[PDB]
């Protein structure tokens, strides 16, 4: 069945209920917690061009939702609004009882389009999508989440928004853009820290290199910098 852990003299053991560990007494339901842990801990890459290869679309499978009771503080939280090319939404809207993931350093708000061949968005490595005290296995539209998994236990006795754009989302040929405003932006490259981008919008709002027209604006970056 579903495995389970136990704390004993500050040492984590598999809670063997198959061979009962009678020495560890379970006295109250307060002694049970259900904790969620982020994939930032394991060391997976966190930038968006490394992220959206782990995601993918599928139809014909129902979604599921399980709750937990505490989670890690996170360093990266994501958000999506992806439209099908005929103008409809790829992602289903969030049913009620869903709030965003509540403690986040940065929010990688990502919009744009893609082919969207399927109904839902699943995680290719079978991880969860951590919402507010509710791990799910799909992505709801417009609700800020984080990635990670859930461990079970037996116990002893603010943010900052970064906006992107994307074209051809999901495939291996998806292009990525920054956003300064709704007309001015700059193409992304892999060697870019987000602090570089923070200096970039501050530089652009200082030097005024924005849209003074009605069209869209795509900078690139100095290839030797």
């Amino acid at each position, epitope marked *: 069945s579903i495995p389970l852990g136990v704390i004993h003299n500050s040492t984590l053991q598999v809670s063997d209920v198959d061979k009962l560990v009678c020495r560890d007494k379970l006295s109250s339901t307060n002694q049970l917690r259900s904790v969620g842990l982020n994939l930032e801990g394991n060391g997976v890459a966190t930038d968006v061009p490394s992220v959206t290869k782990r995601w993918g679309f599928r139809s014909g499978v129902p979604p599921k939702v399980v709750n937990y009771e505490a989670g890690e503080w996170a360093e990266n939280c994501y958000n999506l609004e992806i439209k099908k090319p005929d*103008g409809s939404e790829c992602l289903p809207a969030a049913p009620d009882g869903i709030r965003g993931f509540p403690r986040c350093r940065y929010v990688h708000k990502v919009s744009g389009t893609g082919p969207c061949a399927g109904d839902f968005a699943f995680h290719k490595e079978g991880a969860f999508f951590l919402y507010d005290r509710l791990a799910s296995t799909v992505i709801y539209r417009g609700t800020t989440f984080a990635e990670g998994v859930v461990a079970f236990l037996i116990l002893p006795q603010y943010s900052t928004t970064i906006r992107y754009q994307a074209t051809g989302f999901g495939t291996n040929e998806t292009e990525y853009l920054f956003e300064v405003d709704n007309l001015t932006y700059v193409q992304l490259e892999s060697r870019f820290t987000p602090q570089f981008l923070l200096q970039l919008n501050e530089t652009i709002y200082a030097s005024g*290199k924005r849209s003074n027209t009605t*069209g869209k604006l795509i900078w690139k970056v100095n290839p030797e910098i």
Partner: antibody
Amino acid sequence: QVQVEESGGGVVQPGGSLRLSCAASGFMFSNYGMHWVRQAPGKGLEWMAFIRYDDSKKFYADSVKGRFTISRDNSKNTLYLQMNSLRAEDTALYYCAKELLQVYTSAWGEGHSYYYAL
Amino acid sequence: IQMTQSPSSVSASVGDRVTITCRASQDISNWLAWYQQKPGKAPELLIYTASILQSGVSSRFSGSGSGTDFTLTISSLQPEDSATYYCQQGKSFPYTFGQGTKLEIKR
């Protein structure tokens, strides 16, 4: 000064091949992306295809996927269109067109493109 | 992507007021360019991004729109305005065009 001119027409057998040559003069040809459209001989105008200026995308209409091929040579300053496996509906009027585009560089050591239109 | 010019063919005298509305099957919200093809000529760009007039073209050509509902407006007709009028998709590739409204000028 801004010179866009078609060349390479004629009559080709069905299933045949032809390369068009749209020459360029008067602008930064290696900075602007180019287009092809198609007007039916007695009917309205429709779009065909384009290429981005950096040569990163060769995007085509639904009619000619697996039929036509865009190349471009920024050395010769000449837009190319290779046609292959021609069909009777392709008897038509062909335009090559420049896109509406302005380039600014004044922020740091990298330029830009003001994407509008053709 | 589907675009439809309405109405299809307008005939009016010199100095009259021509309004042609283009429609879109989905949202593009300003991404359209206005063309004018005098017959035998090339389509001359009139208004790009649905509200900004091309240089070299007089201010008699106006019109705007939002969402999927874009309009050209000619404030006063000229005898050189006998032309087929065009729309251009602007946002998503593939492009598509309006079907062509052949404006006739009564001269």
